[PDB]
Amino acid sequence: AFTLADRVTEEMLADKAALVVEVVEENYHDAPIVGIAVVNEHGRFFLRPETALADPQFVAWLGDETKKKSMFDSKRAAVALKWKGIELCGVSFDLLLAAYLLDPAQGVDDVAAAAKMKQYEAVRPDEAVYGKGAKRAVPDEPVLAEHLVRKAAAIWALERPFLDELRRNEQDRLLVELEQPLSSILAEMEFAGVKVDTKRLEQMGEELAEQLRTVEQRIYELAGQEFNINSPKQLGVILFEKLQLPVLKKTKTGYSTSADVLEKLAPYHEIVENILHYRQLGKLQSTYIEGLLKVVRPDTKKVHTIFNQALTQTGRLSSTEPNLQNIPIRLEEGRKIRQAFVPSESDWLIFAADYSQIELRVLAHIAEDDNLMEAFRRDLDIHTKTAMDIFQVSEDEVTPNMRRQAKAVNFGIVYGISDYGLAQNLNISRKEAAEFIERYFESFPGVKRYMENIVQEAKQKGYVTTLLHRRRYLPDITSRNFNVRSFAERMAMNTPIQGSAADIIKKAMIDLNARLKEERLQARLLLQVHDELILEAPKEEMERLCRLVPEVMEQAVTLRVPLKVDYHYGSTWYDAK
DNA sequence: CGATCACGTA
DNA sequence: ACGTACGTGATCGC
């Protein structure tokens, strides 16, 4: 049972509690809190939020760092409270992050899923309580109050067994010193948001709209017929049946029209270059103009992403609503989108700092490959050096094509090398790709030993680990299906690299936040994009940031090779180049 | 409403 | 025979 409380009392304010601050909307920015539950040594309490959040003693308790709270997804609560002007402190255990670290593959998205990992089932999945999609709703108070108290009771019961397993895994510091402090930093970044120049975005959409109309009219006259260019089915009929273009790859239902396939078809018809261009413009228009404008806040003109900290299988963050980790940059036309991302205050600038080749530097460290470590100790161009070694030429004899192919080898090595995967990427035969791979391992025998050993270790232990002891279980490493087993082998090779790189930048973020506070800088973190950090700061702080930010990022961990950070700043995200 | 294509990023 | 890890939008089916 539990107390359905009319007022906040002293016994609800104990120095250790499980706390539920329920935000049902999936995007929690400026979202309602629908109910609160507190479980502690004195009992179990449900509080209505309009009462609790107006009570100065409850607000003081929330913000008291010495009053310890155990929660699930405390960032969601912390951010929803920030929009109400209320500080949440003292979160000493986050069951979402604890479950994520123990096993990211569970996809633990609610308390019930985490509870099931320890044979605790006296709590309902959130989706069973609130419903799915269209029929999603907050239930009546008796039903809501029981759910929130059951969630708090589950958190109360599950802290000890989760912490015990984290300790056995040597992941306790990973939770308490990395992921939990990072959660507070992400909460601040999301709450700050990024300012958008919506007038510039709208002007870009207008120009894109004209150019789409121009290319689309060109495609129709080249096909002698109007059709929905955005339908892969209609497009496949036009290309491979009407225009009789060669079919070099079929999908499941019909024909493949992916950009790769289209590159090869461009010699046969002028329509193919136009379809590629039409796809480029339509992607910018639908996803990065129209889509961005849909989630810009009309009052502040800011976007407030949500960084999912407990989703990826490697320890990376992801970013949603909007995804600010896939804003175009590779092609100049899309890169101009970044001109619409601007500082949030006048006389401020965008500052962007990125690790140089962090994945291959991590590989050099974990493989202890003499040649690879020496290449980074010389700060060589790694792809040119790889071409020199693979193709047995001096630096002067590396042609652009040779560097391009060596780069592709380097990407395959990080991803989990295979002759078929490299052959697909370089448009060469499997036998040729195998020759490249054999030459690579002759030049980097420590990497070869590492890759063999990590696959065997994944088989023996059942999992692989990162530098800071994140883990990923790989049960498919023992499969007798070649495809399934090969997937797991590539994951064994890639996850310690991608995951260790994630560990490093997460530590850098914690270290940076602490240095910014010590220095009393106004500069603030806005975004992380896997190997880069984006900040905004007064123009008068740029000189100090040019020294501080790369140093903090470079010193976040000590590896057998240096870490190298490049940086740029300017009046928009585009200009921070 | 739900997988599939496709394409954007590191 | 599949490159590693993500998210969004569109089409198309029931």
Give the DSSP letter string of A160-214: HHHHHHHHHTT-HHIIIIIIHHHHHHHHHHHHH-EEE-HHHHHHHHHHHHHHHHH
> 3-state class of A92 per DSSP?
strand
Q: Rounded to whole angstroms, how far apart are CA atoms A130 and A121?
A: 18
Could you give the CA distance from residue A332 to residue A56 in angstroms, rounded to a whole number? 53
Q: Is the CB of A329 under 7 A from strand B?
A: yes
What is the number of other CB atoms lying within 10 angstroms of the CB of residue A437? 20
Cα–Cα distance, A14 to A389 (Å, whole number) = 65
Nearest to A115 by CA among A104, A128, A99: A99
- The experimental method behind these coordinates is X-ray
| φ, ψ at A568 (rounded to 5°) | -155, 160
Residue A306 one-letter amino acid: I
CA A459 to chain centre: 27
Q: Measure the CA dihedral A391/A394/A399/A404, to 10°.
A: 50
- Integer CA distances (angstroms), A95 to A48, A157, A179, A239, in order: 23, 11, 11, 52
Measured in whole angstroms, how far is the alpha carbon of residue A443 from the centre of its chain?
33
d(C-alpha A119, C-alpha A273), whole Å:
57
Cα–Cα distances (Å) from A327 to A192, A287, A319, A534, A569, in that order, read 19, 10, 11, 13, 17
The answer to whether the annotation marks A338 as part of a ligand binding site is yes
Q: Which residues of A53-72 are buried (b: 16+ CB within 10 A; e: fewer)?
A: bebeebbebbeeeebbbbbb
Burial class for A183, CB neighbours closer than 10 Å (0-12, 13-18, 19+): buried
Q: What is the residue type of A24?
A: V
Give the CA distances from residue A78 to residues A117, A191, A334, A520, in Å, rounded to whole numbers and listed in that order.
26, 10, 35, 23
- Rounded Cα distance between A305 and A26, Å, is 12
A359 labeled binding residue:
yes
Residue A50: how many CB atoms within 10 A of its CB?
8
d(CA A553, CA A534) in angstroms, rounded, equals 12
Q: Which amino acid is at A391?
A: F
Residue A530 Cβ under 7 A from any strand B atom: yes
A449 is in an annotated binding site: no
Angle at A106 between CA A105 and CA A110, to 5 degrees: 135
Q: Nearest nucleotide to A481 by CA–C1' distance?
A: C1
Could you tell me the domains of chain A?
Answer: 3-194 (3.30.420.10), 196-320 (1.20.1060.10), 359-501 (1.10.150.20)
Give, for A569, the enclosing helix (H) or strand (E).
Answer: strand A565-570
Q: How far apart are CA A533 and CA A569, in angstroms?
A: 12
Resolution for this model in angstroms, one decimal place?
A: 1.7
CB-strand contact A312/B, under 7 Å: no
A280 beta carbon to strand B: under 7 Å: yes
Element (H, E) at A513: helix A482-518
- State the distance between the two ends of chain A, measured CA to CA, in whole angstroms: 59
Find out whether A261 and A239 touch, Cβ atoms under 8 Å: no
β A35-40/A16-22 pair status: antiparallel
Dist CA A22 CA A156 (whole Å) = 16
CA neighbor of A195 nearest in space, from A466, A524, A418 = A524
Q: How many residues does chain A have?
A: 577
How far apart (Å, rounded) are the C-alpha atoms in residues A538 and A106?
Answer: 43
How would you classify the pairing of strands A91-94 and A68-71? Answer: parallel
Rg (C-alpha) for chain A, rounded Å, is 27
Grouping H, G, I as helix, E, B as strand and the rest as coil, residue A512 is: helix
CA A551 remoteness from chain centre: 23
CB A302 within 8 A of CB A296: yes
Give rounded-to-5 percent helix, strand, coil for chain A: 55, 15, 30
| Angstrom distance, A375 CA to C9 C1' | 42
CA A486 / C1′ C1 distance in Å: 9
